[PDB]
Amino acid sequence: SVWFLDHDYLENMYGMFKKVNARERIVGWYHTGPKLHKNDIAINELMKRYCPNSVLVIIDVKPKD
Amino acid sequence: GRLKELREQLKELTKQYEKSENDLKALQSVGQIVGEVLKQLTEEKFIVKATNGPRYVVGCRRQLDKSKLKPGTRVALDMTTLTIMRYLPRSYSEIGGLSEQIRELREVIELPLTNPELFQRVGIIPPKGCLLYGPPGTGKTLLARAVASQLDCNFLKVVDKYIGESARLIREMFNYARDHQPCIIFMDEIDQRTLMELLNQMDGFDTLHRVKMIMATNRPDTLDPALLRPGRLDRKIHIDLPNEQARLDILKIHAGPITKHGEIDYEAIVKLSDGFNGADLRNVCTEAGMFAIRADHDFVVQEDFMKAVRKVAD
């Protein structure tokens, strides 16, 4: 339950990206640690605010097969 | 009170900012070059030509609906990959006595326009058109647009050959005409192997859509015996000779939309000048109106018509 997503940094990166790419916009968030840590739900709620339907994508640093 | 303007202000603060996002987003489209689908080379690639002239081979981007992209279809292509994108295709009786007009013409124009079943059961192809002939003007210039009124549908007025563009354009507009079955093609003032070739479009070239292509015009000096042969030209209607009473009716009709005292001796006026022509009576009315304009008479006095009658008689 100790999770932080700097709102200022998020907004600034959003603005920069849109300025260089208008068509783009937030669609979700991504995290590693294949075992989805229980915090995810809470974090997703934050994203729900930034995007009404924000999807979570878990990526693996080491692919097996 | 001090808050009411703030509420409206908020809508403004967003409004100008609203445009900024719209402007920024709109500030990136690079446009495209417009061209036409010259041919469908393959289900995956097709030959197209930009308006500038160069011709390339391109393909559908994701789903361009090739079923509807038949040879010839406007499409805009990006000038970085040449891919297919959004496609966008870019008075019933004004001649007084019309018994002659409302009779054979009606019975040969609308009868073949309603019940093709009747004739096909008879086994006879419906007549395609009839020819009117007689005095120029009233019978030729006039009552030509009136046919649309009689049938109550919009018609097309068509005014050896240079390149055959006569028949070419006739066929090219034939599909448009057939799209409207009630529509009637009126090739008035129609005037080797184009008129005779003109005899072949009616037989085929999409002439099975229940439309009477009345070749009604005295203009053509040369008359084709094959056309007047039964079938092609079912029958000929001679424009009736004005009897000076139909002239009275025409004057009354045109006298309608005219402001006058009312004590008009219409019979006297018609006897004054034998215009003989509906357009001549139109000129009579116009000249009476002009004479009224002289001295600034909103009405038209009796002598004004007589001057108009005398003037046209010249």
Determination technique used: cryo-EM
| DSSP assignment of B205-256 | SS--SS-------S--SS--HHHHSTTTS--EEEPPPP-SSHHHHHHHHHHT
Contact B48, B40 (CB under 8 A): no
3-class DSSP string for B110-123: CHHHHCHHHHHHHC
DSSP strands (E only) in chain B = 33-39, 45-50, 55-60, 74-77, 83-87, 131-133, 156-157, 185-186, 236-238
To one decimal, the resolution in angstroms is 3.3
Instruction: Classify strands B45-50 and B55-60 as parallel, antiparallel or unpaired.
Output: antiparallel
Flag whether residue B27 sits within 8 Å of chain A, measured between CB atoms: yes
The residue in chain A having the minimum alpha-carbon distance to the alpha carbon of residue B23 is A22
Min Cα distance B69 → chain A (Å) is: 28
Annotated binding-site residue? B83: no
Residue A42 CA to residue B33 CA, distance in Å, equals 49
Contact B188, B216 (CB under 8 A): yes
